[PDB]
């Protein structure tokens, strides 16, 4: 039973500096994976500067002031990951955890109507006791009576206030996804062709808005809308478009010279 | 009219001091459904394993009673699917396959003949001779050395 993380064995997307202490806050089991989450001490202290250390950081959390998906989370080690909605009523800001196109976690600011729904991907389907078919989700939810057209690769729109699955997005050819793993993580694209290969990993071929073709495993894609215009959720400021490394290097030198 | 006339003992398969039966299905049903009964006569359990492997003519219409068999048991084929050539068939219902490969040495820019031998459980659906090329699928441990189980035999 591990209870510690070393700050070197912590994920790189958290961006904790190696010289500040040996340890990182090991996220508890919960909704999201340990490799694939951002625990609430890092959001309150390192992302947002509401807390200067971990001692000011539990003055916020243990008091019941941060809400992940409409419910107050008093754990600094609670795993918040992809598509979660983090509200704070006192400062009046609410955010969504999305991946930006460089693969890192990004806090997308939200309205009040956009902060009620979240988008969740089915990971398993089974029948529970009774004859109730429940749907297992990447965020750990077990929706008991989902839309009967739910398959495993699909996306359920959820509305975390009134816990009612308001919508369904099937996983087909004509849909748009966001990639949540691999080298292509954070990129958004239309689906082109899904190569099955039964017994092994499904490969999904994807085309971007510019036309850049790229592939991933189909367990890494997360469908978020009917097309790239009609996305069901708002995405970070690049909107899944990965610029060239040369062109994005030129633009920062131009912006820094034009600023002085 | 009250008497049923059940099936007689098939001594060709019954050799083994306990009665050889399949645990999946009951042999003794009076009005057995069309679920598991095969073409000619008797009740049989046959299963379709995964990866586009066609079950043989035996294991559906055969008479043998095999546990540890991928087509007629709870043995599931999963993980690795490999190929080898049959080396020895001297064991009872088990063959040893030989996997011959070239090992490249990065220093001396030249390959090197190596081999791995695997004990593979062989169903009575199959009779492979030495030199036959087989396709094996990984299963659970079935003995001290058996992890694989033959799925298809390619003759000669």
């Amino acid at each position: 039973a591990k209870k510690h993380l070393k700050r070197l064995y912590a994920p790189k997307d958290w961006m904790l500096s190696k010289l500040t202490g040996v340890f990182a806050p090991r996220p508890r089991p919960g909704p999201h994976k340990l490799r694939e989450c951002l625990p609430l001490l890092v959001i309150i202290r390192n992302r947002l500067k509401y807390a200067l250390n971990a001692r000011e950081g539990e003055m916020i959390l243990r008091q019941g002031l941060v809400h992940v998906d409409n419910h107050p989370r008093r754990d600094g080690k609670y795993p918040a990951g992809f598509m979660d909605v983090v509200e704070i009523p006192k400062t009046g800001d609410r955010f969504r955890l999305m991946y930006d196109v460089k693969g890192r976690f990004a806090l997308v600011s939200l309205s009040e109507a956009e902060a009620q729904i979240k988008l969740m991907k089915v990971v398993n389907l089974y029948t529970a006791t009774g004859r109730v078919p429940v749907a297992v989700t990447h965020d750990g939810h077990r929706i008991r009576y989902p839309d009967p057209h739910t398959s495993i690769g699909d996306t359920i729109v959820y509305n975390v206030k009134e816990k009612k699955c308001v919508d369904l997005i099937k996983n087909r050819q004509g849909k748009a996804v966001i990639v949540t793993g691999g080298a292509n993580r954070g990129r958004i694209g239309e689906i082109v062709k899904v190569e099955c290969h039964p017994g092994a990993f499904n490969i999904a071929h994807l085309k971007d808005a510019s036309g850049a073709e790229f592939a991933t495993r189909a367990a890494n894609i997360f469908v978020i809308g009917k097309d790239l215009n009609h996305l069901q959720v708002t995405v970070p400021k690049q909107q899944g478009l990965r610029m060239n490394v040369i062109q994005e290097r030129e633009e920062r030198l131009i912006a820094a010279e034009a600023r002085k | 009219p009250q008497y049923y006339h059940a099936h007689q003992v098939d001594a060709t398969i019954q050799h083994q001091k306990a009665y050889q039966r399949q645990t999946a299905v009951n042999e003794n049903m009076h009005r057995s459904s069309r679920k598991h009964v095969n073409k000619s006569g008797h009740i049989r359990y046959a299963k379709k394993i995964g990866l586009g492997f066609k079950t043989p003519a035996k294991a559906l219409n055969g008479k043998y009673i095999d546990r540890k068999c991928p087509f007629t048991s709870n043995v599931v084929i999963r993980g690795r699917i490999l190929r080898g050539i049959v080396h020895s068939t001297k064991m009872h219902r088990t063959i040893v396959i030989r996997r011959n490969y070239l090992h490249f040495i990065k220093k001396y820019q030249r390959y090197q003949k190596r081999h791995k031998s695997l004990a593979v459980h062989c169903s009575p659906a199959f009779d492979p001779k030495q030199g036959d090329e087989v396709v094996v699928g990984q299963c659970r441990p079935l003995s001290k050395t058996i992890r694989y189980n033959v799925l298809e035999v390619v003759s000669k």
Partner: protein, 183 residues
């Protein structure tokens, strides 16, 4: 203690394995139950996860199923008749899985008079007996030992694992298999 590892087994080359750890608790085994006939005495065993595994010592009764009729009846074990592992386990009358036992046969006859109405007259209103009994027939080797008093049967549960002596009645070629080995 008792271990279930391959550290003591020789390699397939015949080489000895040199041991560089202590025994783990996660690789243990325990002493066998050796369940016999007798009045019921069980001892639970604390397994992994805190689950309980009920050792059966001295069992005398179980739920035996008659699979053509898809019913079961709690009957009393009489004798241990044939065991495929050893004839020495018959003599000490050990209950294991798949050993052949004789059971009481009285609830099976009484059920066969209550259902199908055949003895080995009182509800004249309900002859749903006639709705059955026409298509169905009963194997002769069952009906002989059913009225003889004891029925040969096969244990289908693991008593040292579950603390139960459940079973099935021998039918078909399986009964005719074991009748030849006895007599």
């Amino acid at each position: 203690g008792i271990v279930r590892s391959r550290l003591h087994k020789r390699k397939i080359t015949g080489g000895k394995t040199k041991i560089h750890r202590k025994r783990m608790k996660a690789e243990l085994g325990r002493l066998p139950a050796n369940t016999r006939l007798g009045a019921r005495r069980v001892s639970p065993v604390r397994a992994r996860g805190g689950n309980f595994k009920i050792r059966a010592l001295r069992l005398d009764t179980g739920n035996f199923a008659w699979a053509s009729e898809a019913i079961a009846h709690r009957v009393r074990l009489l004798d241990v008749v044939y065991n495929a592992t050893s004839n020495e386990l018959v003599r000490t009358k050990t209950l294991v899985k798949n050993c052949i036992v004789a059971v009481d046969a009285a609830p099976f006859k009484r059920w066969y008079a209550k259902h199908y109405g055949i003895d080995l007259a009182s509800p004249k209103l309900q002859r749903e007996w006639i709705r059955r009994r026409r298509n169905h027939r009963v194997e002769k080797a069952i009906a002989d030992q059913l009225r003889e008093g004891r029925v040969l049967a096969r244990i289908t549960s693991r008593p040292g694992q579950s603390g139960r002596a459940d079973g099935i009645l021998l039918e078909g070629a399986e009964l005719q298999f074991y009748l030849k080995r006895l007599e």
